[PDB]
């Protein structure tokens, strides 16, 4: 009687999951976002499904409880536009914040785990205003940009002595991660130093500088200054890197080599991460959910 009015009223992922149509839902997400690995998406179906049903007790208590559905709208509404209740950005935001919390706390691994939960929640989000669909995307964008940024620094950390060439490469790419500036600081600082413990003032003066142009005065800031000086006194090329600040490119989210406009690239239908043609039809490294390259009709969330 109930569940149906939902499906009849909206055929989107969220609602499908909510109404109990998991096959129908998996299908929709392949076509629209090319989702392929269903595993890290289990608890989200569960949460969606369970989150709109509650149980009232039934008189002789030792008799199974009674189901009740939580609708997303009150009495006064198109007796058509009847739909299940579903989390909303309210939370997506909440979660995103924990990412930032952990970013500041220097707990990379955890930060990532957050962002993904955000990405997953967006994927199965359901919205009222065309407007919020817009924001859902802005959040979604940002997320990958943080998973990316972190994914890099994280791997720059998993490097053995001698790979020096590669390390400065990554440290400077991390800088490319479109994060809120304030957060990009930590990146810039990382780059700034490692291109000093390695006589590379031809970029050190750059990073330290690109840093000072956001952070005015603080303990850390003061070092960045002193670094731009002792560095602006010897245009050194101690170690040549692929990275050139003055150009337009994106960082491949699998390799961490840059992708210039000349480069043949492949995107991911959900995330938007870009990779080298090398890795087409593989699982994206941002939110290990969808197939890179596969074509999607587009992520549906507006009701």
């Amino acid at each position: 009687m109930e569940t149906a009015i939902w499906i009849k009223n909206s055929k989107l992922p969220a609602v499908l999951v909510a109404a109990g149509a998991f096959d129908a839902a998996v299908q929709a997400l392949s076509k629209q976002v090319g989702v392929v690995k269903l595993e890290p998406l289990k608890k989200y179906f569960t949460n969606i499904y369970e989150g709109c049903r509650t149980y009232i007790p039934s008189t002789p208590c030792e008799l199974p409880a009674q189901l009740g559905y939580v609708r997303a709208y009150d009495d006064t509404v198109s007796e058509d536009q009847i739909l299940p209740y579903v989390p909303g950005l309210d939370v997506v935001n909440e979660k995103m914040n924990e990412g930032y919390k952990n970013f500041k706390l220097n707990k990379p691994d955890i930060a990532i785990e957050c962002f993904r939960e955000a990405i997953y929640r967006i994927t199965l989000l359901m919205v009222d205003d065309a407007e919020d669909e817009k924001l859902a995307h802005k959040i979604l964008e940002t997320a990958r940009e943080y998973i990316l940024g972190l994914s890099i620094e994280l791997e720059r950390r998993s490097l053995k002595e001698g790979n020096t060439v590669r390390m400065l490469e990554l440290a400077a790419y991390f800088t490319k991660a479109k994060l809120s500036p304030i957060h990009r600081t930590n990146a810039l600082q990382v780059a700034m130093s490692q291109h000093f413990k390695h006589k590379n003032f031809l970029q050190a003066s750059y990073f330290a500088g690109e840093f000072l142009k956001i952070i005015s005065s603080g303990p850390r800031a003061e070092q960045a200054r002193k670094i731009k000086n002792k560095a602006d006194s010897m245009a050194s090329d101690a170690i040549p890197i692929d990275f050139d600040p003055y150009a337009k490119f994106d960082i491949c989210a699998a390799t961490y080599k840059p992708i210039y406009e000349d480069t043949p690239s492949v995107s991911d239908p959900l995330t938007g991460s870009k990779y080298v043609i090398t890795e087409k039809d593989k699982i994206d490294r941002i939110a290990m959910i969808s197939k890179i390259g596969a074509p999607a009709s587009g992520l549906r969330i507006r009701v």
Binding site: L38, T46, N47, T54, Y85
Partner: protein, 293 residues
């Protein structure tokens, strides 16, 4: 009317009092009196089969022994094939339904409702409507209800009226009709007039119902408050599962990890609705993992 007190105290959840309202009828053996005595007794610290003599109270003994297993053997056996009272039936249908035989459970109910008020009928009626809804036959639940209502419009509501509203309530809960309006005032009042888990928990659902997590939250910290989680140890442990259930469905509306630490209790404890489903659903998903590897 007569013992409208005993009834109004049963369907509200304070067996504590419900019992003392029957104590008042100093040993006047009436089937209705027995039913409710037995039932409140079960609802409390402990039941005491009062007489295995009554081809009714002898049933109750069975019913309870039933509850400690899943064999409707002697129960259904020492009853079927001989026409009997709705009160007797009531217990059977329940038994049956606790097993999952809902289609039959409801049948059992209607069979009794068919002795048209031969004492206990309204009690069955509710049960039928419940059993119906358990199986998702809202259509029928209503029909059964509707057709009994507009039927006995002979102001027979001598007290069963509150048993009746209870039924209606459960129906309204499923329909989701007047969830915000009239159906909210119903519980609202009930809670204010009789503070118990039965009533407070009802209110709770109505709130989750209305997306009002704010108010819901309150109702929960309150149910945890010393007065309920401690002061009424009895008809508070009786409802722990269901409570937990709601704790979750609310914890979820705000997306809190708790989903586990919480239903961990319900899991390593009971196996009702929420868990019944949580199982089915968990399987359905792992079922799709097989299908797309």
């Amino acid at each position: 009317m007569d013992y409208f007190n005993i009834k109004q105290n049963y369907y509200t959840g304070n067996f504590v009092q419900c019992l003392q309202e029957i104590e008042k009828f100093s040993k006047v053996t009436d089937n209705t009196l027995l039913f409710y005595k037995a039932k409140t007794l079960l609802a409390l610290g402990q039941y005491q089969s009062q007489d295995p003599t009554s081809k009714l109270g002898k049933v109750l003994d069975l019913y309870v022994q039933f509850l400690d297993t899943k064999n409707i053997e002697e129960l259904e056996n020492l009853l079927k094939d001989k026409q009997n009272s709705p009160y007797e039936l009531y217990l059977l249908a329940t038994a049956q339904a606790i097993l999952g035989d809902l289609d039959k459970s409801l049948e059992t109910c209607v069979e009794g409702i068919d002795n048209d008020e031969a004492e206990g009928t309204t009690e069955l009626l509710l049960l039928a409507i419940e059993v119906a809804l358990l199986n998702n036959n809202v259509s029928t639940a209503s029909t059964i209800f509707d057709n009994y209502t507009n039927a006995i419009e002979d102001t027979v509501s001598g007290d069963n009226e509150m048993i009746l509203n209870l039924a209606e309530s459960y129906i309204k809960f499923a329909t989701n009709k007047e969830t915000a309006t009239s159906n909210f005032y119903y519980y609202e009042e009930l809670s204010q007039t009789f503070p118990t888990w039965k009533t407070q928990l009802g209110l709770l659902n109505l709130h989750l119902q209305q997306r009002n997590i704010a108010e819901a939250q309150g109702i929960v910290e309150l149910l945890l408050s010393d007065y309920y989680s401690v002061e009424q140890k009895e008809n508070a442990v009786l409802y722990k599962p269901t409570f937990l259930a709601n704790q979750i469905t609310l914890a979820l509306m705000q997306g809190l990890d708790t989903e586990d630490l919480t239903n961990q209790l319900v899991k390593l404890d009971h196996e009702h609705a929420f868990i019944k489903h949580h199982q089915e659903i968990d399987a359905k998903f792992d079922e799709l993992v097989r299908k797309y590897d």
